[PDB]
Amino acid sequence: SLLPVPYTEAASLSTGSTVTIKGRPLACFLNEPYLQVDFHTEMKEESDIVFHFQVCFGRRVVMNSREYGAWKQQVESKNMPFQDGQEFELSISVLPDKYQVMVNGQSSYTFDHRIKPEAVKMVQVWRDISLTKFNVSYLKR
């Protein structure tokens, strides 16, 4: 749709920041489209990932970090609030201890900080979605 995918935006995060994403899967859930959101430490796509969030729509979600080039301990969830064929609204809030992921207004996943969120310099949203909205909030000190 409107925004380019893969979508990359320079970003800074700290406690109180919110990343808001509105989009739609490009395929029915039977075909297992993916969504991935990565919070990177540099603008380069091969840079480390403080927070990796990968949805296989209809199946599972995996979360991880990639540190000095290596994936660390995977967290896997079978929670699946996303609805087949529907637009979704994803909110990722930076809390003192964790990221909190809201899906269509419902708390759905959390991930404890492994690296300070201040290390983030870039957010990438990619895989099998169209994107109509992306925002990072910058209202807090």
Added chain:
Amino acid sequence: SLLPVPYTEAASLSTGSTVTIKGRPLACFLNEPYLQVDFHTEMKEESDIVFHFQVCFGRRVVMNSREYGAWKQQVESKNMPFQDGQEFELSISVLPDKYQVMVNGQSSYTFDHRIKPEAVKMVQVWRDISLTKFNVSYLKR
């Protein structure tokens, strides 16, 4: 790039048909972009899949069929002729007994027919690639 992705084309296949695909991954291999090619029995994306070919670039390839809505026996290969950051040329030939997948001119995967190739009505190419060329040959009786 040039062609829309996801890419869908109505198609017919029989012995001697060749499907030729030229494209490039949208991400470095460290980020595990995917490529998927599905030969469908109807134009609808939820239709059965006579031949499913899914590359996780740098990692593995899985092949399967989806019959009456259900995935059948997965075949997994660790053969990985695709090169990080490079354009690829994929050829899929319909042989009497199997599909043969050539990558950059090199025989790389085969998959025995589970359903007659004459059941195919559509080909879809999707996931994390750009596409510059897609062709189905129609020269044989």
